[PDB]
Design a protein around this ligand. Sequence first.
Ligand SMILES: O=C(O)[C@H]1OC(=O)[C@H](O)[C@@H](O)[C@@H]1O
Ligand SMILES: O=C(O)[C@H]1OC(=O)[C@H](O)[C@@H](O)[C@@H]1O
Ligand SMILES: [Ca+2]
Ligand SMILES: [Ca+2]
Ligand code: NA
Ligand code: NA
Lengths: 840, 837
Amino acid sequence: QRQTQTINDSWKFLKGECTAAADSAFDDSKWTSIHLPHTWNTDAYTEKDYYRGTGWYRRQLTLPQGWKEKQIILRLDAAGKSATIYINGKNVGEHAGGYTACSFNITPFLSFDTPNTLAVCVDNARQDIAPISGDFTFFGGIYRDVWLTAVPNQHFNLTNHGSDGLFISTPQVSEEQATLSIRGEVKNDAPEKATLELTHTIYRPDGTLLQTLKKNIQLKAGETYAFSNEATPVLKPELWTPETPRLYRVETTLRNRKTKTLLDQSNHYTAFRWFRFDGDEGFFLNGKPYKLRGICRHQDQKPIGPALTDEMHRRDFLLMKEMGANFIRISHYPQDDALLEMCDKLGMLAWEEIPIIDIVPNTPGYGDNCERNLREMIRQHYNHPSIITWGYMNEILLVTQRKYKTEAELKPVLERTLALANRLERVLKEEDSTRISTMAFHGSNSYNETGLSKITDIVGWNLYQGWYGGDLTGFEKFLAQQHQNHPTHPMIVSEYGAGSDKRLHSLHPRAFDFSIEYQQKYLEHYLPVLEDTPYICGGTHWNFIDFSSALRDESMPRINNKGLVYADRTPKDVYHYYQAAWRKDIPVLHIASRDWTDRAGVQQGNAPVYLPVKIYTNLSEVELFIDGISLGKQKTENYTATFEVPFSNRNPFLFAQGNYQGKTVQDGLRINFTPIPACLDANNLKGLELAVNVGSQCFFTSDESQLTWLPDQPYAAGSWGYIGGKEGTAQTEIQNTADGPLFQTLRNEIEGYRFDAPQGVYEIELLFTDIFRRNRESTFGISINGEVVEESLSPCKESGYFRALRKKYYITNDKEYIDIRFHSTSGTCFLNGIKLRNIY
Amino acid sequence: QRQTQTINDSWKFLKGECTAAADSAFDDSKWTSIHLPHTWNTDAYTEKDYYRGTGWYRRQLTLPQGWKEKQIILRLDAAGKSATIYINGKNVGEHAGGYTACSFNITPFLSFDTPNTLAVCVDNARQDIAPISGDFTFFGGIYRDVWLTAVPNQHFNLTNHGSDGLFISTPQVSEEQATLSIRGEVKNDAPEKATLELTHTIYRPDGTLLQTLKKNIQLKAGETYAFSNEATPVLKPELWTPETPRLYRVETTLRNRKTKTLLDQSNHYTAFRWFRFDGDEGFFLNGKPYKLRGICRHQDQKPIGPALTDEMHRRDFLLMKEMGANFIRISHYPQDDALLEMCDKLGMLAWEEIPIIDIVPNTPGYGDNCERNLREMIRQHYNHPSIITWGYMNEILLVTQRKYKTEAELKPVLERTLALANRLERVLKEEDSTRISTMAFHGSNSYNETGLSKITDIVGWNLYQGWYGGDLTGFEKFLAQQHQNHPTHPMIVSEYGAGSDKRLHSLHPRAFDFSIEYQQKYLEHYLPVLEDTPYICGGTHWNFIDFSSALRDESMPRINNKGLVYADRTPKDVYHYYQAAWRKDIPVLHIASRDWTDRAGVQQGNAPVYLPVKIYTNLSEVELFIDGISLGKQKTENYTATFEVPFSNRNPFLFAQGNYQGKTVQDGLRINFTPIPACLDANNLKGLELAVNVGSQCFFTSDESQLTWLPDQPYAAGSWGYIGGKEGTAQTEIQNTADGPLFQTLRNEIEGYRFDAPQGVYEIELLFTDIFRESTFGISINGEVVEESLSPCKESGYFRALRKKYYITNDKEYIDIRFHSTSGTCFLNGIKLRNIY
Ligand SMILES: O=C(O)[C@H]1OC(=O)[C@H](O)[C@@H](O)[C@@H]1O
Ligand SMILES: O=C(O)[C@H]1OC(=O)[C@H](O)[C@@H](O)[C@@H]1O
Ligand SMILES: [Ca+2]
Ligand SMILES: [Ca+2]
Ligand code: NA
Ligand code: NA
């Protein structure tokens, strides 16, 4: 029979080049011991310049004696970006492509009397393999399962593009009936003739046997026999949807015709459904209107990168499934078998694509390698009924149009780009006639003007109005313009989203403060547009997770923080705005404050400090309590309500209540509240650490110190705050702090900062980062109540640009105010943070 | 006058030795930019062999023109383990000790016409500097503040063992009156004499002037001058406790005698309190009985090491204070000024000690460096009224008794130890006659036999009965035997605790399973003993935090996990047990399930699955609800109550309430629950991932995958479980897994593992790790051989994780895995089953 098991254990690993690494007699005792899956690019979660090059893997294979007469097939589900395989020093074969599987019949290279050496040379530097550009990390290593499969000399073909070698499709599907087509190849690796029996057994969703198909086949020595068997038409087929994922098991068995001995067996699911995309009326599933409620999912997890175990892929899926999504855009690369299994079985429509992104280079072999990767993806995943569309390109004009601004520079690149698109479109439709082709665009009409949008069956727009410029309403405007000018191109919003940082909150959220609240304002705008516009087939949110992009700075360097869930897969609050809107079958009532559990605020006297607490829910009406006090009931709109909550106590308990389908629904949590006095005196200074996010309207809570830094405020008589200057903001990474966001904002041209406070000894901490690398170069003095504390401070000369300075001073105040004045010398005065404590 | 500011910023740094690193014109462009505080030992949070050696720090000094005629004093509050200071290439000084400060008048080497180069060479390799052994990482680098203080040529001495040069004490303190003594040194670095007015201003707690001393003094060029000025006795003085931290500010000022212009100035707090330790009745503060409710606290935080900013120090102090502690054992080394500031001002009694641990080696120069470190600690922190006791040794016999067995071998080592001990003891009492001396013992009467327990004023026992062997009840038995045999040695339990791991839970918690629940068990037993035994002066819990100890393996390698709060300072549920028992001023009601938010259990049919939910509270009666259904009222004992809670829904809401001094009190949280079926069939297998922590009574929940692995259960008809074997357990780290504990337990001599299950195709994952440092065995499934001869230790080695997956076709009504040993034993560390087709 067939024995399939992993060989993920007991590997030795070496980063870099190594002469002789494939020899069986090599001494790899000093190499690193590892267990697949594996990447050598954990460094990308800190370092922007992560290592791209060569890495070697070694494993001993001591084969079972019971396998002496079988064919041994080696399968690498993934190696990024390329792999060359060695058995006992001999080059067995290679593979180009970091997200498709490859497979090899290694039987002629193996020995059953002595042990064998399997060595793999992996490379993530090759410029002739996609992607060569794109907003994610190109991790190197063997980060998916590796298998050995042992079969008898007659077995299904396992070396057709690293696939299962079988291909099952439904040529016709209606409510009344459907046809079923069962195809594949049998391979005869014996030196003589073989007379076999092929059997297809087809089961209903409930497990009962529907039909058995039997053919005799004769194979000459060494022959590959293609079979194509049609089943009896299936009457009143049970139709598949993400809500009702009815599967029909197809068991395909190979038997010795004489002896009836079982040789090989391969199992697959098929399912019966049909779909359609309409430019006016959107998407239809089994003849009914169906809004695609989608998410995109990258495949890494900080800090192990793409080296996920399969229960991790399943965990990601359950989260997406429990949120209400019925559609996943698997991007920008094809992903784990374990993922697609859940899409079929638990129910989720799928788009899947290869990563041809940003720009079509002029690299020999690139086109050819793209073609092979498209075939490998379609053939490896042909049997997943959840998949309805293949794609091969994403924003293929984005870098082209940035780099080249002349007609002469552009013409060749566009020509090369349209030729490869048309090339791949032909390959797609010849690989698979049962599915729709798609392509994803960045937000520009150049895709219509260049002809790129005239190629695939449907089109996707990556739209970010209200995040990367423009206003939120430019999103529906853009879609309306496209539908007017190209009404026959059915439309998916293949990317939309906005960045967010658990550390940052704002009562006045604005784009690129990275506050939790701004991403919610953005998503709260976009989802109803997606739900209620008929010519929008659906959208796929970007992205389900905060994911690795080594090249990103912004509020969380190395991470693209547009997730609905943090990197470690804890959900953000806004996850439950999706759930509330997309799950009708359960009550959803979520106090939107897990993202904001450490609050602080400026208190007048002993009066409460008010701060919004938002709720996400599908209940019509909710009541909010704090420490047992009701704040009233509110009517929900767009799945949300916001209460102005009076905080006083240090550890308040928040509690929410409503009715859903005649039952009581409840939620609650404790958070922390810290009051900071607006007017300082001897009493209220004891224990006070007054910290201010100068130049920002965001509260910043360090996930390292747990200290919250308050939004800046202007100086007022009896209080404290700034004097002069204007807000400034950088996105560049800030050296030498864990609290980047605090230093990315400053008050530029500041004139002073003042606290009215009693007489005593105070510790003053100032925070500096020069964000104007443009610079002349800022240098300035600083005094406090007229006592110079810096004669000529220049952060960029002493430390450089975009680097933290935190300087503490002890000062004796003999006034009733602490007046910090800035005194220009060159460039501008600025201040990114201030923090005050009373010492004596 | 005096300006103090930091130079923590704008450093370059290079790991290792370097030719010509102190040269003013050395090229450090390609060095790593860093900002103090800093450590080069972040590696210690993953690598056991952390880098111990040399590191180089360079920063430019551009002196303000206003300092031209001032004295510049450099201060390094801490550098581990030793540091040497260059200014413009010239050796200025060096210091030995990684937890005390050092200072140098650097004026002679500085220019004011050109930038100055500051270079510091640091070394955490040196074996002649305490500690040379002990249960924590010897972090290297400059991990506390660095200061420049500029003063006039007539200034208080700032180069007396890196202290402030002033020393304030109260010779007599009673309810009616107290005496106050103010001492210090004035130095005169001018090239000729000078005439000064020295003034002490003393302020009440409410900020009012109580008294002004003034004394005239003259100093010849380059002379230092010692003063000691008694003060008018203070009448009906405001006493200080953790609860009432009444402090008197003392301002000391230096004015030129003719021009009366102010020169230098230094502020310090004093306070009025007395105390004593009674071998029979415990501890007394201001004449009243007082239970010492202490915790110990290491100073690092994963993964930044001890490179903490001062708000992190203050954050730590607040959690300890909000938990209700009144005592803190600052160990095993003196800690940050920022922390001590809070013990004075917000109120916590303090024990502070230097890290002389495990064994007094024969290492040239070790003794001398120890004595200097003791002098330093005491001089540097002399003015902190929170401190009532100094110490210098912890468990100084522990490694000595492992390494040397015979009387002949022990002789010299014991001689060195008693000598070093008595020597430091006498240095302590020279340095400070106002505080109590202490030492900390491990749990052996040999500290008595060898005479070590006669030396200090009080003794500390680090006791671990119920964790490192023995029984929970051995704790009180050990202490009652000491009291019987040494009634005049007043006792503090200076350490006690149990490891815990958020990933691990058990309905039957046992020591060294590292379950949340066992730590709670251990502590719930110890704390009443501490509270209710009067000859126990108090205790200090070990430890307040999970902290770095690179040499440790066990469930969380590199980490000692006996904290009350995780390394990131999130509290464990048990933290609120202490808070229930030590805070009577407020209501405490805490559902003890923040450590257990991801639950799973074997479900019979569709009946609910019972799992305990514990509650910590100072109320006498609590009610627990799940998803709105009440589970009754329960009377609390020992600040806690447990409910058998019926789980069913996937995302249940837990809710508790009761009454405290009139008011209604509430708490709630959501958690996640995943039922696993006891009897598998075609329906319940859809989406099922049956994962079993084979060999263990703990649920293990990966913090990497979030999957929960169930307690092993024996096979029963109609269900699933193991067949044969016994539990086996290792504490050695496991390579190549983030889920160590999963692999550190196993079923040894296992015969089979069986699932009753429908026909179909199944994915079976087997987890192996050989912990027995050669086992070899075949594995069959339903009569088909799936491994002819598997030997984990030959394929992978010992203590290395093996995860193997197989696709299996079951044409029977069960899945029968069998183990056939041909050598060594058969073992299996975990299994996980999915149905595929
Ligand atoms: O900027 C972003 O968030 C993303 O936006 C896009 O349009 C890209 O297709 C995607 O790869 C980037 O990650
Ligand atoms: O092993 C432990 O947990 C502790 O035991 C002790 O008694 C040691 O003094 C301490 O440094 C250790 O950390
Ligand atoms: Ca996989
Ligand atoms: Ca400090
Ligand atoms: Na700021
Ligand atoms: Na186990």
